């Protein structure tokens, strides 16, 4: 019973940002040292918890949200940020107690023809609630006229593709993002480390 981050980080394929993939880590021990002592991550921003120290403290649940965005938008995966990704795809709450882990993945998620299979939402009547996962393809009514699933004048499909090319600039290259959220309820904890 060793926490399988193995089948999250090293996972062969990743999810599209708006359709982000949550893994409920429970009843296992994790040497988190495995992750941070590895040099090969662009962005290991931790918010409201020392990861060096939680290898001797027991949390009820570790949630691991995995998905792909272009490197430019990595910064937007942080509490209080706003924009396309922040407000329409994957929101984080202000009292976030986890880490954002992102590595460049041009090598994996970019075709010569352009890997259009990774997507992102563009419009929405309102902003996402924290940790909301919206996958509806409602034909988005911008202007006055109500759309009856008919596209066109003031009516648009709410998702778009990324088009990752190996020749794209480092910013428009695809980064793979894991987000380790930690919760501590009043139920007996089940995700500790060694020390």
């Amino acid at each position: 019973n060793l926490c399988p981050f193995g089948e999250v980080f090293n996972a062969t394929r990743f999810a599209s940002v708006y359709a982000w993939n949550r893994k409920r880590i429970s009843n296992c021990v994790a040497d988190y040292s495995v992750l941070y002592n590895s040099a090969s991550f662009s962005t290991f921003k931790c918010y409201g918890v020392s990861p060096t120290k939680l290898n001797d403290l027991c949390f009820t649940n570790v949630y691991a949200d995995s998905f792909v965005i272009r490197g430019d938008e990595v910064r937007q995966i942080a509490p209080g940020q706003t924009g396309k990704i922040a407000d329409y795809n994957y929101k984080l709450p202000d009292d976030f107690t986890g880490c954002v882990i992102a590595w460049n993945s041009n090598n994996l998620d970019s075709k010569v023809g352009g890997n259009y299979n990774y997507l992102y939402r563009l419009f929405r009547k309102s902003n996402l609630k924290p940790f909301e996962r919206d996958i509806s393809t409602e034909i988005y009514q911008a202007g006055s006229t109500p759309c009856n699933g008919v596209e066109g004048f003031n009516c648009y499909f709410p998702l778009q593709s990324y088009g990752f090319q190996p020749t794209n600039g480092v910013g428009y290259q695809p980064y793979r993002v894991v987000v380790l959220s930690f919760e501590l309820l009043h139920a007996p904890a089940t995700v500790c480390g060694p020390k």
């Epitope: 941070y36 662009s42 931790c46 918010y47 409201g48 120290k53 910064r75 976030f96």
Partner: antibody, heavy 120, light 114 residues
């Protein structure tokens, strides 16, 4: 240990001159670490100046420093910096660089501190 | 937007008696999410940098004796040194890390009453 912070040597400077003191991260997993800077003035308390995340160089300042000093980070040598446009006598103090692993984290690792003395 | 005031400023204690230090915050530092106050305690023996003694108000750092223990309820926090010893003489600061800018108290000198 996990992480140790080494700091630039002692700096004897003249009022007006500019100065960039270093703080390097000895060891592995520096990537998670956010290096803060603290000023202890001669026989005074600890003032938190600002923190930077070398990763995306995400920098925050104390209102008491915003437009005085620049905190930079050359992440390619795990080195956070603190510099002065032009040094006051006041800026005479000892300057500790202090890492936490993450933000809203207690500073769990401290450099021995750089002593800066601005006077003829 | 937070700000701290410690008390008292000085504390003289006979070797092996208790010693309490109060640290009050103008804003609550409780993380609603995980019922923990984001408040810490630092010792600084002169010539050295500050040493972390306690985090989340009450949890001890590695390399810190049992006699050190912190308590606190929202806006009011205390550091208690039961059985004061030789090498415990130093300045003691509390620091909030609920949010930037991190802020320290004015410090507390602790000396051995003889």
């Amino acid at each position: 240990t996990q992480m140790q912070l080494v700091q630039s040597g002692t700096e004897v400077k003249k009022p007006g001159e500019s100065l960039k003191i270093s703080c390097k991260g000895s060891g592995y997993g520096f990537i998670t670490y956010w290096i803060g800077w603290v000023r202890q003035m001669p026989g005074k308390g600890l003032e938190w100046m600002g923190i930077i995340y070398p990763g995306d160089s995400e920098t925050r300042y104390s209102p008491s420093f915003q437009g005085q000093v620049t905190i930079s980070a050359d992440k390619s040598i795990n080195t956070a910096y603190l510099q002065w446009s032009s040094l006051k006598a006041s800026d005479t103090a000892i300057y500790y660089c202090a890492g936490g692993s993450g933000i809203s984290t207690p500073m769990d690792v401290w450099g021995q501190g750089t002593t800066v003395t601005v006077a003829s | 937007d937070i700000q701290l005031t410690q008390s008292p400023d000085s504390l003289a204690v006979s070797l092996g008696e208790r010693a309490t230090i109060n640290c009050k915050s103008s804003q609550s530092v409780l993380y609603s999410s995980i019922n923990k106050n984001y408040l810490a305690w630092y010792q600084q023996k002169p010539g050295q940098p500050p040493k972390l003694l306690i985090y989340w108000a009450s949890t001890r750092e590695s390399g810190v004796p049992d006699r050190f223990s912190g308590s606190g309820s929202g806006t009011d926090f205390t550091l208690t040194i039961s059985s004061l010893q030789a090498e415990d003489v130093a300045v003691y600061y509390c620091q909030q890390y609920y949010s930037t800018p991190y802020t320290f108290g004015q410090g507390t000198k602790v000396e051995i009453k003889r």
